[PDB]
């Protein structure tokens, strides 16, 4: 199907406690495959998936250099943004950056990304055209004017259309055993009495990959959206994910409730009911 590659970066200044911490992680779809942490003992880009380990030493050297260099430019930008926002040097601040590409089933570029946040708020973002910018405020407009003069968007467009897509295709082939395998959820429905009049029906989805999934409860075929407790999809820790949906049901009405499971690893969307 469709696939994605993303690089995530966070710098967090810590005045009086050394230089800003820099952590960056790379993903293909929902699979972590590289990491760099400026606080590690001998900081290097490290593999986090088996299909990336075969890349040779010059790969790891180039990725290490880029990460270290991005750590340095974030530290300069943190100082710059203190000026742009008229802020004291005493507080901790955060810079986040994500970039990457989505490709369709044929491997062609669907769209690229490159966007920033300062202290958790949108700062500047490359638009879907990969040629213009959206700046969130007059400070980010200063960066916008800098980046337009240095023609940053052209370099990004060349990367996102070229290397991003091509290396994603390479990774997808090398890790096809896992990256191109969908693991359907194992599903069941539990029943948890609350009082003489009420019980909780909880619909479980376990062990699935990728993370995208739909769990819904229906009552007499009508979606219980407002009365359904839906936990955030969560990592099991073994590459797979978990989720549940729950409704509080009048005792005796259990059979009017159906749980519906959509997942790309399922040929047909599933329907299941509480089975006493």
């Amino acid at each position: 199907g469709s696939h994605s590659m993303r690089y995530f970066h966070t710098s967090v200044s810590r005045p009086g406690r050394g230089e800003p911490r820099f952590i960056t992680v790379g993903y293909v779809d929902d699979t972590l495959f590289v990491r760099f942490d400026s606080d590690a003992a001998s900081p290097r880009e490290e593999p986090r998936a088996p299909w990336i380990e075969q890349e040779g030493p010059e790969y790891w050297d180039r990725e290490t250099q880029i990460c270290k260099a991005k750590a340095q430019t974030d530290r300069e930008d943190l100082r710059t943004l203190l000026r742009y926002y008229n802020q004291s040097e005493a507080g901790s601040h955060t810079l986040q950056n994500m970039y990457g590409c989505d490709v369709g089933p044929d491997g062609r570029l669907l769209r690229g990304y490159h966007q920033d946040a300062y202290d958790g708020k949108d700062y500047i973002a490359l638009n879907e055209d990969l040629s213009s910018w959206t700046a969130a405020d007059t400070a980010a407009q200063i960066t916008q004017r800098k980046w337009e003069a240095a023609r940053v968007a052209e370099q990004l467009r060349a990367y996102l259309e070229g290397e991003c897509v091509e290396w994603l295709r390479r990774y997808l082939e090398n890790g096809k055993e896992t990256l191109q395998r969908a693991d359907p959820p194992k599903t069941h429905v539990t029943h948890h009495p609350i009082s003489d009049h009420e019980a909780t029906l909880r619909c479980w989805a376990l062990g699935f990959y990728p993370a995208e999934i739909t769990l819904t409860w229906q009552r007499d075929g009508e979606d219980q959206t407002q009365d359904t407790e839906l936990v955030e999809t969560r990592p099991a820790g073994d590459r797979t994910f978990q989720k549940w949906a729950a409704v509080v049901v009048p005792s005796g009405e259990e059979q009017r409730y159906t749980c519906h499971v959509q997942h790309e690893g399922l040929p047909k969307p599933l329907t299941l009911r509480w089975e006493p």
Binding site: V12, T190, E232, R234, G237, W244
Partner: protein, 100 residues
């Protein structure tokens, strides 16, 4: 600035079966800023060998982390996750409920 308090789920990797080894997970998400303290508790006391994922973040820029440790559940042992964050007037403890 903007501050967002962490969501907390504590759960096992596999369905819990007393006497059988598992992994205990505490997943904190939705929070900002990134500084956070997360402990896994066994009967009120801090478990020592706890690992955690590398800091990443969701589409809305809020952060998430997985803290985890091997464990073997029993009928009597209580497990929990203790989280402190700038948004919390006091540490929040979420008990491990094998049904959640």
């Amino acid at each position: 600035m903007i501050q967002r308090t962490p969501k907390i789920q504590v759960y096992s990797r596999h369905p819990a079966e007393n006497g059988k080894s598992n992994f205990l997970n505490c997943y904190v998400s939705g929070f900002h800023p990134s500084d956070i303290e997360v402990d896994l508790l066994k009967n009120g006391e801090r478990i020592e060998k706890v690992e955690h994922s590398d800091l990443s973040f969701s589409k809305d820029w809020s952060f998430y982390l997985l803290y985890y440790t091997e464990f073997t559940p029993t009928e009597k042992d209580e497990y929990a996750c203790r989280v402190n964050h700038v948004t919390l007037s006091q540490p929040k403890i979420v008990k491990w409920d094998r049904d959640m």
